[PDB]
Write a protein that binds this ligand. Sequence first.
Ligand code: VUU
Lengths: 300, 237
Amino acid sequence: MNTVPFTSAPIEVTIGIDQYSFNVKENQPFHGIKDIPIGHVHVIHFQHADNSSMRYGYWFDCRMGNFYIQYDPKDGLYKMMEERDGAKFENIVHNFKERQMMVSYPKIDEDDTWYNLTEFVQMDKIRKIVRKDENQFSYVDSSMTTVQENELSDPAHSLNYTVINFKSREAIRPGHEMEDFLDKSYYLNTVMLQGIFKNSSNYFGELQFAFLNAMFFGNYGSSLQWHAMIELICSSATVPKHMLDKLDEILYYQIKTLPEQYSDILLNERVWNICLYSSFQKNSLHNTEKIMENKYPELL
Amino acid sequence: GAMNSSNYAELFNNDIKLFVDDTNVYRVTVHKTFEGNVATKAINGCIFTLNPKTGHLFLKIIHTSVWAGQKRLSQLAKWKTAEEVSALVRSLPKEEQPKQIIVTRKAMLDPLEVHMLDFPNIAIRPTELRLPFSAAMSIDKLSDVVMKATEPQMVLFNIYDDWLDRISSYTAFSRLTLLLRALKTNEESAKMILLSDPTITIKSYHLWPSFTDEQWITIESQMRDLILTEYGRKYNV
Ligand SMILES: N=C(NCCc1cccs1)NC1CC1
């Protein structure tokens, strides 16, 4: 179990760690988060009490270094940093734990939610979507745009998701216009899976990472990417059976975890109704259809 | 985006454009089978592709053989249309290619956009105008060439005959749409109007009779009456 110490909490903020969150009052004696499960990526995220505008945060993996949070009063945000002095870090964490100034990552033992949301998410792929090679952790926020969004303005601050566009020459083979537009199997299996992602684990990883950014930060371009990657699969007549089974489980946990109160802004009515009731895979997502119908029958 | 009453004069400016109408591509008769079931028999169709400024009509005849062994023909017809329009543009010199293609039904938008991905500078647009191009098969010479065809064939027409010698393309288009609206609302009455006077003939290289300017005003008035007064017989006013 690893630890992300905080130098201090000078400004009132709601802090999230994975799907958990808690309120820290301005100048409250908060010095970080302990007992963080090793083996998974994690996200620590922030929303200031005084400006709910701008949810931001850091993707990190405690196996890749010792990380801490420190408020910057010039730039006005909680920043993640790496401590290279290993002895100083263990010493710091020991003192804060001894004085019980840290909240415990509150994982119930029955609870595989976070594993199921991040099953295919790897730090190394996150850092290829969020480019800032000088840090081992990756910053994301509400307002960052995607490479495809910038094609329709600061490139260093973009989310480099895989561009999916159903009316593109990449998607459509000359002479198979109708075939490839109505059955996207070629684009899924040959262009994307064999060509770009190499395997379905990498595809699912980007899909899961897009959902989580959309959900945690209200990142609109991530939400578009998550739906696009679902729709590409559901609109393909020929999909490996194992991918469909896994997709059903992935979406099931994503739908289970979504705040009921933001379903209206995180779920695209058209894509979901198409995927569950019209597409080639309309009969292949039993768990997802059942939770969708029982939790958001309005959307349908 | 779309094309409607507000930007109507754009049709007659100097940017090459084409209207594409697919309503006569897939045509069937419905009949009873010996077992008493119902079956369709397809008949020849056509794609109606018109330059509204020049009157140039590219009439691609769709022979029934193109449906043989195919399923979901109404959906296929939209993609075949898009394939044929795309082939036409590719066959034209660059300086004759359209800058816009306006489809008369929104269901042609995606099939045409996909077939034209190679031409990202050609705008594909729908329209809110209810244009009467389906009545093209009520023009006798166009119907004749479509029904007689034994193979895929493209036939070229000027749907304005020689009218642009005397009137503007705006007026020529207004006349055409009035004639087609009339043929669509009451074909027999419309054709009676057009041919009643045996002395006004259709030249061999034309589609419509050789009316003088005065006779066209009379004709145009009679077509407006028809459209108002057939509207009466169908709608008790
Ligand atoms: N009317 C024509 N040719 C010129 C008129 C045009 C319409 C469409 C493009 S050019 N007929 C030719 C087959 C003999």
